[PDB]
Amino acid sequence: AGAAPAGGEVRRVTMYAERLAGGQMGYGLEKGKASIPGPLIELNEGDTLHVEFENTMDVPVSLHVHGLDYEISSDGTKQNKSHVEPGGTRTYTWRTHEPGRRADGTWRAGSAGYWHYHDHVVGTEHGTGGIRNGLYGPVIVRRKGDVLPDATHTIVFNDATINNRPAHTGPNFEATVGDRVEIVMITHGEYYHTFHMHGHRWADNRTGMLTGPDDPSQVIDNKICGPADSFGFQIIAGEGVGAGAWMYHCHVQSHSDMGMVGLFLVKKPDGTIPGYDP
Amino acid sequence: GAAPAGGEVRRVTMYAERLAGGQMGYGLEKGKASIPGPLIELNEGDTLHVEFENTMDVPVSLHVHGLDYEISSDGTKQNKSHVEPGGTRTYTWRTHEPGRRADGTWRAGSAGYWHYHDHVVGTEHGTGGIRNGLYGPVIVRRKGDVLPDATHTIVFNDATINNRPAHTGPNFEATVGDRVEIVMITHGEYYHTFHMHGHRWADNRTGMLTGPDDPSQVIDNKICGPADSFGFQIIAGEGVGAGAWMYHCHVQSHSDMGMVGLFLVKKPDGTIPGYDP
Amino acid sequence: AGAAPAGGEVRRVTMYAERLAGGQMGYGLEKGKASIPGPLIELNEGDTLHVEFENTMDVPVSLHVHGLDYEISSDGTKQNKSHVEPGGTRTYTWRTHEPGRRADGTWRAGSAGYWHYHDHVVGTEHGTGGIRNGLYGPVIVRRKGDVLPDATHTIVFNDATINNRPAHTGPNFEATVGDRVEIVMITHGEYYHTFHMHGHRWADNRTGMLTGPDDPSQVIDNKICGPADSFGFQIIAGEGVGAGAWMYHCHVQSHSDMGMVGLFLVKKPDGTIPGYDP
Ligand SMILES: [Cu+2]
Ligand SMILES: [Cu+2]
Ligand SMILES: [Cu+2]
Ligand SMILES: [Cu+2]
Ligand SMILES: [Cu+2]
Ligand SMILES: [Cu+2]
Ligand SMILES: [Cu+2]
Ligand SMILES: [Cu+2]
Ligand SMILES: [Cu+2]
Ligand SMILES: [Cu+2]
Ligand code: NA
């Protein structure tokens, strides 16, 4: 696979907050193309991102990001008046940094990780309405040399839904046996959850992959998460287990019974999935 | 002692059976089902063929966490890998050692504290079967892992421990200095926090720090949710001595309602100072 | 910055349990000086601490500690008769130890970490009433060479309150940009929470700081916690982000909405906070 390069680029992108059907709200990079979850933003440590933001809605909205470097003017809260008025525009700036030794000998942690952005002002001063309506999305910051995946899928447990979809409607994600598949897992709202994936497992650390034989991180296939938690991992699709419709679901029993389930559809090279009859 | 390299093909018979009071359990022999079900121990590289029989009048399945299995041993109705009433099926579990892939990455091995449970009784996620007692622990050891003097399994199933009536333990006994392994599994609807008085462990794969370079937090209290599993080994009474050492869920209403038990640590002469039930 | 020395001192302190206003109860080091959270106790690995304890209330109380070494006679439970009757006195003894290789060849974990003490007998035999009333406090055990902070702040999520405070009353904590600030985070009661801090992040490990480039711990700014969980970390105030009123809060949406929120007030050297009014 590929490997992430050293960062240091200054990038710019447009983002819009838009109303969607059914009282929903989403972010998008192009006007009229908002989505829930919002678009995946990927940066290498050291990169700067200027987000030229426009609120197309009739209510104030904001952009608050986890983990990355931002000044108080990009906090995205009413507290420091860094929200965006209806119809207004604003440049949010996110920075990231590499890890390194401070002059005093301590080690500064870098920005790399699985992160997310979301609204902080719709409905309440903590964005309860905006988050419920769909204003959230994933952010990945990569360290130089991190392994790059063939595909990235984002799964958000928001209240009792996955990605604000109606119960029992996935999402499903497709891969071929051997694909290096990255999962970004974000939780929002009111409830705790446990994320479980059949047939696969990952390391409970920054990258979801063990660094080598000396990494003592627990290897897991089930993880408890609460509102605004984010983690991610990579798996080799079907590794040691073969093709199939591999369930993922919240493992809180009533949540899985009510439709917080989806399928990791791992196909053979001929594109078929043994035993899978929809 | 230490765990050997795995690679054996092992076989075991397992039965799902009704127990008293609407409960259900797994067992290795007919009539000896238990809650939790039997402890299954493997070394990385071992294969296990579970020759499974459903003795009940409703369908049941066997779904395992962590281990390698093909979709035909998923243990779900969706993949048609459940067991009809009176039926039999061989579930196959495989395990593997860690190793460097061709692309240069490190493949994580199977070693860890895992568990198996039903996936079809009551609902297509086994909500009824899990509630009824259809769960059990699996340990997969890596070559060189330290072996314990005893292993005890503690399952927080909804507001119960091991499906026992409230305020009824279970209790476990050890002597000061014993190396005691705890397997901790959670099931059902609720989050919990597992706490043990007088003892502590490392929040990592084995529950023990690998040495002075391991940065894992050392804890005596751990949040867990449905289908979480973890485990650890402690030295009974290490630095604290003999006594009736409580363990309990630390969610206050849960400990109040009876999610509590005792780790009875005896001196070599058998005495437990001040213990008076 | 400073570094913790090797421990091994026999230390002594008096502690009192007292009623406070409005049905609350607290621990203090001197009579009339009980606080919620109770006083911060700091030890170096190897130190022994003798707590000369006195119950000044009209109901039995106890003192139970997490993480530290104690004999069964200092368990602090009525079950073992290590509670304190009204007006009674008792000496609770806590010990700590350095890590080291056992005779059996395995590595014995040291006492170092972020811990806490609390009541175990008020209301119920698990201290539900006493904890609810305010009988809890932080304990920090440092390892030789641990980095010492400029200030330490304790944040306890107790049911749906912070430090038993009325909703929407903080607490707030002040620092200057560049300060090395230590946060002790304890959870009590009935609910799970997720602790989030704007503008800052830490490592999910013992110290909250990565040991160096080989530490694979996830770097986070959001962490799920349940009753009797404790963790801590150090941050450099405003590092890479600047001065400002930086929010911290539980991220469970109804909890933040109903006032489990405070401010990390990071000042410029002149003492001002950009974008914030008192
Ligand atoms: Cu916030
Ligand atoms: Cu859920
Ligand atoms: Cu599973
Ligand atoms: Cu947030
Ligand atoms: Cu499942
Ligand atoms: Cu519980
Ligand atoms: Cu499961
Ligand atoms: Cu207790
Ligand atoms: Cu909360
Ligand atoms: Cu406690
Ligand atoms: Na870890």
PDB file of C-alpha atoms in Angstrom, chain A residues 21-276:
ATOM      1  CA  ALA A  21     -35.101  16.804   3.495  1.00  0.00           C
ATOM      2  CA  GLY A  22     -37.022  15.871   6.627  1.00  0.00           C
ATOM      3  CA  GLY A  23     -35.650  18.732   8.705  1.00  0.00           C
ATOM      4  CA  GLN A  24     -32.093  17.456   8.305  1.00  0.00           C
ATOM      5  CA  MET A  25     -28.986  19.595   7.854  1.00  0.00           C
ATOM      6  CA  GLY A  26     -25.674  18.685   6.274  1.00  0.00           C
ATOM      7  CA  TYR A  27     -22.258  19.984   5.321  1.00  0.00           C
ATOM      8  CA  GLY A  28     -20.913  19.749   1.780  1.00  0.00           C
ATOM      9  CA  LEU A  29     -17.960  20.901  -0.279  1.00  0.00           C
ATOM     10  CA  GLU A  30     -20.152  22.006  -3.199  1.00  0.00           C
ATOM     11  CA  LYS A  31     -23.369  23.988  -3.030  1.00  0.00           C
ATOM     12  CA  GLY A  32     -26.379  21.714  -3.293  1.00  0.00           C
ATOM     13  CA  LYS A  33     -24.327  18.590  -2.506  1.00  0.00           C
ATOM     14  CA  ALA A  34     -24.440  18.451   1.294  1.00  0.00           C
ATOM     15  CA  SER A  35     -24.350  14.984   2.847  1.00  0.00           C
ATOM     16  CA  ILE A  36     -24.787  13.238   6.199  1.00  0.00           C
ATOM     17  CA  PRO A  37     -22.096  12.435   7.354  1.00  0.00           C
ATOM     18  CA  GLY A  38     -20.368  15.472   5.906  1.00  0.00           C
ATOM     19  CA  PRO A  39     -17.397  15.130   3.560  1.00  0.00           C
ATOM     20  CA  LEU A  40     -14.250  13.368   4.699  1.00  0.00           C
ATOM     21  CA  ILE A  41     -11.389  15.832   5.267  1.00  0.00           C
ATOM     22  CA  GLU A  42      -7.888  14.321   5.120  1.00  0.00           C
ATOM     23  CA  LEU A  43      -4.708  16.137   6.171  1.00  0.00           C
ATOM     24  CA  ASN A  44      -1.085  15.179   6.774  1.00  0.00           C
ATOM     25  CA  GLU A  45       0.510  16.419  10.008  1.00  0.00           C
ATOM     26  CA  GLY A  46       1.812  19.914   9.384  1.00  0.00           C
ATOM     27  CA  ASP A  47      -0.903  20.785   6.854  1.00  0.00           C
ATOM     28  CA  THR A  48      -3.051  23.893   7.285  1.00  0.00           C
ATOM     29  CA  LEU A  49      -6.652  23.950   6.013  1.00  0.00           C
ATOM     30  CA  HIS A  50      -8.593  27.153   5.376  1.00  0.00           C
ATOM     31  CA  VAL A  51     -12.300  26.312   5.218  1.00  0.00           C
ATOM     32  CA  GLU A  52     -14.156  29.063   3.327  1.00  0.00           C
ATOM     33  CA  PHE A  53     -17.501  28.446   5.011  1.00  0.00           C
ATOM     34  CA  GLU A  54     -20.960  29.651   3.940  1.00  0.00           C
ATOM     35  CA  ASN A  55     -24.205  29.203   5.904  1.00  0.00           C
ATOM     36  CA  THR A  56     -27.044  28.843   3.386  1.00  0.00           C
ATOM     37  CA  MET A  57     -29.593  28.237   6.174  1.00  0.00           C
ATOM     38  CA  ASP A  58     -31.970  30.528   8.080  1.00  0.00           C
ATOM     39  CA  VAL A  59     -30.399  29.775  11.487  1.00  0.00           C
ATOM     40  CA  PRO A  60     -26.876  30.458  12.821  1.00  0.00           C
ATOM     41  CA  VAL A  61     -24.553  27.472  12.394  1.00  0.00           C
ATOM     42  CA  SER A  62     -20.950  26.717  13.284  1.00  0.00           C
ATOM     43  CA  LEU A  63     -18.001  24.436  12.589  1.00  0.00           C
ATOM     44  CA  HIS A  64     -16.247  22.923  15.629  1.00  0.00           C
ATOM     45  CA  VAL A  65     -13.425  20.430  15.083  1.00  0.00           C
ATOM     46  CA  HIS A  66     -11.878  17.923  17.462  1.00  0.00           C
ATOM     47  CA  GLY A  67      -8.182  17.351  17.901  1.00  0.00           C
ATOM     48  CA  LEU A  68      -6.749  19.820  15.400  1.00  0.00           C
ATOM     49  CA  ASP A  69      -5.049  23.118  16.201  1.00  0.00           C
ATOM     50  CA  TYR A  70      -7.354  26.107  15.961  1.00  0.00           C
ATOM     51  CA  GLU A  71      -7.371  29.566  17.476  1.00  0.00           C
ATOM     52  CA  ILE A  72     -10.323  30.711  19.554  1.00  0.00           C
ATOM     53  CA  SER A  73     -11.634  32.544  16.477  1.00  0.00           C
ATOM     54  CA  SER A  74     -12.134  29.105  14.856  1.00  0.00           C
ATOM     55  CA  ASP A  75     -13.650  27.473  17.945  1.00  0.00           C
ATOM     56  CA  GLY A  76     -17.105  27.537  16.347  1.00  0.00           C
ATOM     57  CA  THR A  77     -19.095  28.629  19.410  1.00  0.00           C
ATOM     58  CA  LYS A  78     -21.376  31.511  20.333  1.00  0.00           C
ATOM     59  CA  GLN A  79     -19.157  32.114  23.398  1.00  0.00           C
ATOM     60  CA  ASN A  80     -16.422  33.651  21.233  1.00  0.00           C
ATOM     61  CA  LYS A  81     -18.791  34.726  18.427  1.00  0.00           C
ATOM     62  CA  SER A  82     -17.167  32.303  15.983  1.00  0.00           C
ATOM     63  CA  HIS A  83     -20.485  31.008  14.605  1.00  0.00           C
ATOM     64  CA  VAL A  84     -21.790  32.009  11.152  1.00  0.00           C
ATOM     65  CA  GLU A  85     -24.915  34.139  10.760  1.00  0.00           C
ATOM     66  CA  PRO A  86     -27.707  33.071   8.378  1.00  0.00           C
ATOM     67  CA  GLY A  87     -26.466  33.621   4.845  1.00  0.00           C
ATOM     68  CA  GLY A  88     -23.039  34.597   6.146  1.00  0.00           C
ATOM     69  CA  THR A  89     -19.505  33.498   5.342  1.00  0.00           C
ATOM     70  CA  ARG A  90     -16.400  32.922   7.422  1.00  0.00           C
ATOM     71  CA  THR A  91     -12.991  31.336   7.006  1.00  0.00           C
ATOM     72  CA  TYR A  92     -12.339  28.636   9.591  1.00  0.00           C
ATOM     73  CA  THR A  93      -8.666  27.715   9.866  1.00  0.00           C
ATOM     74  CA  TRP A  94      -7.388  24.341  11.093  1.00  0.00           C
ATOM     75  CA  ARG A  95      -3.722  23.678  11.677  1.00  0.00           C
ATOM     76  CA  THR A  96      -1.860  20.483  12.498  1.00  0.00           C
ATOM     77  CA  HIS A  97       1.608  19.709  13.772  1.00  0.00           C
ATOM     78  CA  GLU A  98       4.081  16.851  13.831  1.00  0.00           C
ATOM     79  CA  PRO A  99       5.189  15.343  17.139  1.00  0.00           C
ATOM     80  CA  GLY A 100       8.548  16.336  18.503  1.00  0.00           C
ATOM     81  CA  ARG A 101      10.874  16.844  21.436  1.00  0.00           C
ATOM     82  CA  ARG A 102      10.394  20.119  23.280  1.00  0.00           C
ATOM     83  CA  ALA A 103      13.494  22.052  24.316  1.00  0.00           C
ATOM     84  CA  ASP A 104      12.801  20.924  27.898  1.00  0.00           C
ATOM     85  CA  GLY A 105      12.993  17.260  26.827  1.00  0.00           C
ATOM     86  CA  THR A 106       9.292  16.444  26.940  1.00  0.00           C
ATOM     87  CA  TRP A 107       7.560  14.945  23.912  1.00  0.00           C
ATOM     88  CA  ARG A 108       4.815  16.963  22.219  1.00  0.00           C
ATOM     89  CA  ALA A 109       2.054  14.791  20.768  1.00  0.00           C
ATOM     90  CA  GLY A 110       1.268  15.358  17.103  1.00  0.00           C
ATOM     91  CA  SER A 111      -2.133  15.977  15.553  1.00  0.00           C
ATOM     92  CA  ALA A 112      -2.460  12.562  13.869  1.00  0.00           C
ATOM     93  CA  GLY A 113      -5.611  10.630  14.577  1.00  0.00           C
ATOM     94  CA  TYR A 114      -9.235   9.962  13.768  1.00  0.00           C
ATOM     95  CA  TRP A 115     -11.208  13.135  14.458  1.00  0.00           C
ATOM     96  CA  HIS A 116     -14.436  14.869  13.468  1.00  0.00           C
ATOM     97  CA  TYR A 117     -16.183  18.209  13.046  1.00  0.00           C
ATOM     98  CA  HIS A 118     -19.752  19.155  13.932  1.00  0.00           C
ATOM     99  CA  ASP A 119     -22.074  22.052  14.682  1.00  0.00           C
ATOM    100  CA  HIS A 120     -21.987  23.709  18.110  1.00  0.00           C
ATOM    101  CA  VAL A 121     -24.813  26.315  18.006  1.00  0.00           C
ATOM    102  CA  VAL A 122     -27.973  25.000  16.289  1.00  0.00           C
ATOM    103  CA  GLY A 123     -30.737  24.449  18.823  1.00  0.00           C
ATOM    104  CA  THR A 124     -28.568  24.890  21.916  1.00  0.00           C
ATOM    105  CA  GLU A 125     -25.180  26.363  22.692  1.00  0.00           C
ATOM    106  CA  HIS A 126     -23.791  22.820  22.337  1.00  0.00           C
ATOM    107  CA  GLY A 127     -25.329  22.155  18.929  1.00  0.00           C
ATOM    108  CA  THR A 128     -27.850  19.573  20.126  1.00  0.00           C
ATOM    109  CA  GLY A 129     -30.222  20.421  17.273  1.00  0.00           C
ATOM    110  CA  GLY A 130     -27.497  20.740  14.649  1.00  0.00           C
ATOM    111  CA  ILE A 131     -25.889  17.433  15.611  1.00  0.00           C
ATOM    112  CA  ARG A 132     -29.269  15.658  15.721  1.00  0.00           C
ATOM    113  CA  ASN A 133     -30.081  17.091  12.275  1.00  0.00           C
ATOM    114  CA  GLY A 134     -26.898  15.699  10.654  1.00  0.00           C
ATOM    115  CA  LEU A 135     -24.198  18.411  10.959  1.00  0.00           C
ATOM    116  CA  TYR A 136     -21.194  16.161  11.582  1.00  0.00           C
ATOM    117  CA  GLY A 137     -18.366  14.685   9.537  1.00  0.00           C
ATOM    118  CA  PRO A 138     -15.008  12.886   9.722  1.00  0.00           C
ATOM    119  CA  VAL A 139     -11.484  14.308   9.761  1.00  0.00           C
ATOM    120  CA  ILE A 140      -8.389  12.131   9.421  1.00  0.00           C
ATOM    121  CA  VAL A 141      -4.904  13.469  10.141  1.00  0.00           C
ATOM    122  CA  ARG A 142      -2.129  11.145   9.007  1.00  0.00           C
ATOM    123  CA  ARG A 143       1.432  10.867  10.275  1.00  0.00           C
ATOM    124  CA  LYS A 144       4.274  10.503   7.785  1.00  0.00           C
ATOM    125  CA  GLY A 145       4.566   6.820   6.962  1.00  0.00           C
ATOM    126  CA  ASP A 146       1.035   5.827   8.020  1.00  0.00           C
ATOM    127  CA  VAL A 147      -0.370   3.103   5.775  1.00  0.00           C
ATOM    128  CA  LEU A 148      -2.909   4.334   3.230  1.00  0.00           C
ATOM    129  CA  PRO A 149      -6.119   2.358   2.618  1.00  0.00           C
ATOM    130  CA  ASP A 150      -7.925   1.277  -0.525  1.00  0.00           C
ATOM    131  CA  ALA A 151     -11.182   2.813   0.769  1.00  0.00           C
ATOM    132  CA  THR A 152     -12.479   4.681   3.829  1.00  0.00           C
ATOM    133  CA  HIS A 153     -15.955   4.265   5.313  1.00  0.00           C
ATOM    134  CA  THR A 154     -17.469   6.465   8.019  1.00  0.00           C
ATOM    135  CA  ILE A 155     -19.965   5.068  10.542  1.00  0.00           C
ATOM    136  CA  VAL A 156     -21.625   7.559  12.908  1.00  0.00           C
ATOM    137  CA  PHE A 157     -23.824   6.345  15.757  1.00  0.00           C
ATOM    138  CA  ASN A 158     -25.997   9.433  16.249  1.00  0.00           C
ATOM    139  CA  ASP A 159     -28.603   8.927  18.987  1.00  0.00           C
ATOM    140  CA  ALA A 160     -30.380   5.675  17.926  1.00  0.00           C
ATOM    141  CA  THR A 161     -29.467   5.942  14.209  1.00  0.00           C
ATOM    142  CA  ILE A 162     -26.499   5.187  11.986  1.00  0.00           C
ATOM    143  CA  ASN A 163     -25.693   8.239   9.840  1.00  0.00           C
ATOM    144  CA  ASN A 164     -29.231   9.620  10.406  1.00  0.00           C
ATOM    145  CA  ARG A 165     -30.656   6.850   8.255  1.00  0.00           C
ATOM    146  CA  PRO A 166     -34.030   5.240   8.958  1.00  0.00           C
ATOM    147  CA  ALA A 167     -33.757   2.120  11.087  1.00  0.00           C
ATOM    148  CA  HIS A 168     -32.536  -1.079   9.414  1.00  0.00           C
ATOM    149  CA  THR A 169     -31.260   0.690   6.256  1.00  0.00           C
ATOM    150  CA  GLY A 170     -27.521   0.116   6.679  1.00  0.00           C
ATOM    151  CA  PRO A 171     -25.353   1.605   5.453  1.00  0.00           C
ATOM    152  CA  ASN A 172     -23.673  -1.366   3.786  1.00  0.00           C
ATOM    153  CA  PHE A 173     -20.087  -1.118   2.553  1.00  0.00           C
ATOM    154  CA  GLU A 174     -18.574  -3.264  -0.188  1.00  0.00           C
ATOM    155  CA  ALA A 175     -15.026  -4.586  -0.488  1.00  0.00           C
ATOM    156  CA  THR A 176     -13.126  -7.407  -2.168  1.00  0.00           C
ATOM    157  CA  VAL A 177     -11.228  -9.992  -0.119  1.00  0.00           C
ATOM    158  CA  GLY A 178      -7.791  -8.543   0.579  1.00  0.00           C
ATOM    159  CA  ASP A 179      -8.800  -4.870   0.310  1.00  0.00           C
ATOM    160  CA  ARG A 180      -7.231  -2.630   2.946  1.00  0.00           C
ATOM    161  CA  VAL A 181     -10.341  -0.978   4.376  1.00  0.00           C
ATOM    162  CA  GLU A 182     -10.334   1.975   6.767  1.00  0.00           C
ATOM    163  CA  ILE A 183     -13.229   2.595   9.167  1.00  0.00           C
ATOM    164  CA  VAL A 184     -13.843   5.895  10.941  1.00  0.00           C
ATOM    165  CA  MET A 185     -16.214   5.518  13.872  1.00  0.00           C
ATOM    166  CA  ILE A 186     -17.860   8.569  15.458  1.00  0.00           C
ATOM    167  CA  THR A 187     -20.561   8.794  18.118  1.00  0.00           C
ATOM    168  CA  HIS A 188     -22.927  11.703  18.821  1.00  0.00           C
ATOM    169  CA  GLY A 189     -26.008  12.602  20.797  1.00  0.00           C
ATOM    170  CA  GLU A 190     -27.308  11.192  24.072  1.00  0.00           C
ATOM    171  CA  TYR A 191     -26.448   7.484  24.336  1.00  0.00           C
ATOM    172  CA  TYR A 192     -23.494   5.192  24.815  1.00  0.00           C
ATOM    173  CA  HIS A 193     -22.969   2.425  22.238  1.00  0.00           C
ATOM    174  CA  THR A 194     -20.743  -0.563  21.561  1.00  0.00           C
ATOM    175  CA  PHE A 195     -19.443  -1.029  18.023  1.00  0.00           C
ATOM    176  CA  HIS A 196     -18.863  -4.654  16.928  1.00  0.00           C
ATOM    177  CA  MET A 197     -17.738  -6.119  13.597  1.00  0.00           C
ATOM    178  CA  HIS A 198     -18.089  -9.800  12.749  1.00  0.00           C
ATOM    179  CA  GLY A 199     -15.099 -11.614  11.297  1.00  0.00           C
ATOM    180  CA  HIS A 200     -12.566  -8.819  11.878  1.00  0.00           C
ATOM    181  CA  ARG A 201     -10.601  -7.195  14.699  1.00  0.00           C
ATOM    182  CA  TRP A 202      -8.278  -4.241  15.281  1.00  0.00           C
ATOM    183  CA  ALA A 203      -5.809  -2.836  17.806  1.00  0.00           C
ATOM    184  CA  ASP A 204      -7.090  -0.343  20.366  1.00  0.00           C
ATOM    185  CA  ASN A 205      -4.516   2.378  19.606  1.00  0.00           C
ATOM    186  CA  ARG A 206      -4.005   5.458  17.402  1.00  0.00           C
ATOM    187  CA  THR A 207      -4.028   3.705  14.025  1.00  0.00           C
ATOM    188  CA  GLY A 208      -5.996   0.552  14.852  1.00  0.00           C
ATOM    189  CA  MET A 209      -2.913  -1.438  13.802  1.00  0.00           C
ATOM    190  CA  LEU A 210      -0.203  -2.831  16.052  1.00  0.00           C
ATOM    191  CA  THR A 211       3.117  -1.079  15.511  1.00  0.00           C
ATOM    192  CA  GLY A 212       5.008  -4.350  15.820  1.00  0.00           C
ATOM    193  CA  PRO A 213       5.612  -7.197  18.271  1.00  0.00           C
ATOM    194  CA  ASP A 214       6.215  -4.834  21.230  1.00  0.00           C
ATOM    195  CA  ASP A 215       2.857  -2.991  21.069  1.00  0.00           C
ATOM    196  CA  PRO A 216       0.749  -4.242  24.023  1.00  0.00           C
ATOM    197  CA  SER A 217      -2.538  -2.657  22.888  1.00  0.00           C
ATOM    198  CA  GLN A 218      -5.550  -4.889  23.372  1.00  0.00           C
ATOM    199  CA  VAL A 219      -6.824  -6.425  20.147  1.00  0.00           C
ATOM    200  CA  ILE A 220     -10.627  -6.073  20.091  1.00  0.00           C
ATOM    201  CA  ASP A 221     -13.713  -6.500  17.925  1.00  0.00           C
ATOM    202  CA  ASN A 222     -16.086  -4.605  20.251  1.00  0.00           C
ATOM    203  CA  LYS A 223     -15.648  -1.093  21.656  1.00  0.00           C
ATOM    204  CA  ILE A 224     -17.715   1.156  23.918  1.00  0.00           C
ATOM    205  CA  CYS A 225     -18.087   4.753  22.757  1.00  0.00           C
ATOM    206  CA  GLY A 226     -20.007   7.819  23.851  1.00  0.00           C
ATOM    207  CA  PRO A 227     -21.033  11.197  22.438  1.00  0.00           C
ATOM    208  CA  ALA A 228     -18.232  12.913  20.461  1.00  0.00           C
ATOM    209  CA  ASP A 229     -15.871   9.927  20.699  1.00  0.00           C
ATOM    210  CA  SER A 230     -13.972   9.102  17.548  1.00  0.00           C
ATOM    211  CA  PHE A 231     -11.672   6.264  16.611  1.00  0.00           C
ATOM    212  CA  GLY A 232     -10.617   4.453  13.478  1.00  0.00           C
ATOM    213  CA  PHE A 233      -8.784   1.417  12.196  1.00  0.00           C
ATOM    214  CA  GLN A 234      -7.798  -0.503   9.090  1.00  0.00           C
ATOM    215  CA  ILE A 235      -8.577  -4.151   8.385  1.00  0.00           C
ATOM    216  CA  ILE A 236      -7.699  -6.488   5.548  1.00  0.00           C
ATOM    217  CA  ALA A 237     -11.139  -7.472   4.264  1.00  0.00           C
ATOM    218  CA  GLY A 238     -11.796 -11.172   4.797  1.00  0.00           C
ATOM    219  CA  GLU A 239      -8.306 -11.818   6.178  1.00  0.00           C
ATOM    220  CA  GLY A 240      -8.296 -15.338   7.633  1.00  0.00           C
ATOM    221  CA  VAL A 241     -12.095 -15.516   7.300  1.00  0.00           C
ATOM    222  CA  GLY A 242     -12.998 -15.255   3.590  1.00  0.00           C
ATOM    223  CA  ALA A 243     -15.803 -13.577   1.694  1.00  0.00           C
ATOM    224  CA  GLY A 244     -19.237 -13.017   3.197  1.00  0.00           C
ATOM    225  CA  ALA A 245     -21.814 -10.541   4.394  1.00  0.00           C
ATOM    226  CA  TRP A 246     -20.066  -9.599   7.646  1.00  0.00           C
ATOM    227  CA  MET A 247     -22.363  -7.834  10.079  1.00  0.00           C
ATOM    228  CA  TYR A 248     -21.417  -4.740  11.997  1.00  0.00           C
ATOM    229  CA  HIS A 249     -23.805  -3.360  14.572  1.00  0.00           C
ATOM    230  CA  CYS A 250     -24.155  -1.701  17.901  1.00  0.00           C
ATOM    231  CA  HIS A 251     -24.031  -4.526  20.427  1.00  0.00           C
ATOM    232  CA  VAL A 252     -26.394  -2.932  22.946  1.00  0.00           C
ATOM    233  CA  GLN A 253     -29.059  -5.557  22.431  1.00  0.00           C
ATOM    234  CA  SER A 254     -32.093  -3.291  22.039  1.00  0.00           C
ATOM    235  CA  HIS A 255     -30.125  -1.039  19.658  1.00  0.00           C
ATOM    236  CA  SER A 256     -29.229  -3.914  17.337  1.00  0.00           C
ATOM    237  CA  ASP A 257     -32.822  -5.172  17.586  1.00  0.00           C
ATOM    238  CA  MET A 258     -34.087  -1.729  16.536  1.00  0.00           C
ATOM    239  CA  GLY A 259     -31.893  -1.469  13.464  1.00  0.00           C
ATOM    240  CA  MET A 260     -28.417  -0.163  14.341  1.00  0.00           C
ATOM    241  CA  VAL A 261     -26.945  -2.791  12.024  1.00  0.00           C
ATOM    242  CA  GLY A 262     -25.185  -2.822   8.680  1.00  0.00           C
ATOM    243  CA  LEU A 263     -23.193  -5.118   6.408  1.00  0.00           C
ATOM    244  CA  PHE A 264     -19.537  -5.210   5.434  1.00  0.00           C
ATOM    245  CA  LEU A 265     -20.070  -7.014   2.107  1.00  0.00           C
ATOM    246  CA  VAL A 266     -16.761  -8.769   1.375  1.00  0.00           C
ATOM    247  CA  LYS A 267     -16.766 -10.185  -2.159  1.00  0.00           C
ATOM    248  CA  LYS A 268     -14.732 -12.941  -3.797  1.00  0.00           C
ATOM    249  CA  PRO A 269     -12.611 -11.899  -6.801  1.00  0.00           C
ATOM    250  CA  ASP A 270     -15.553 -12.843  -9.052  1.00  0.00           C
ATOM    251  CA  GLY A 271     -17.673 -10.306  -7.147  1.00  0.00           C
ATOM    252  CA  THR A 272     -19.998 -12.818  -5.489  1.00  0.00           C
ATOM    253  CA  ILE A 273     -20.730 -13.117  -1.788  1.00  0.00           C
ATOM    254  CA  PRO A 274     -21.263 -16.710  -0.582  1.00  0.00           C
ATOM    255  CA  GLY A 275     -24.425 -17.257   1.431  1.00  0.00           C
ATOM    256  CA  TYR A 276     -25.648 -13.673   0.995  1.00  0.00           C
TER     257      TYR A 276
END
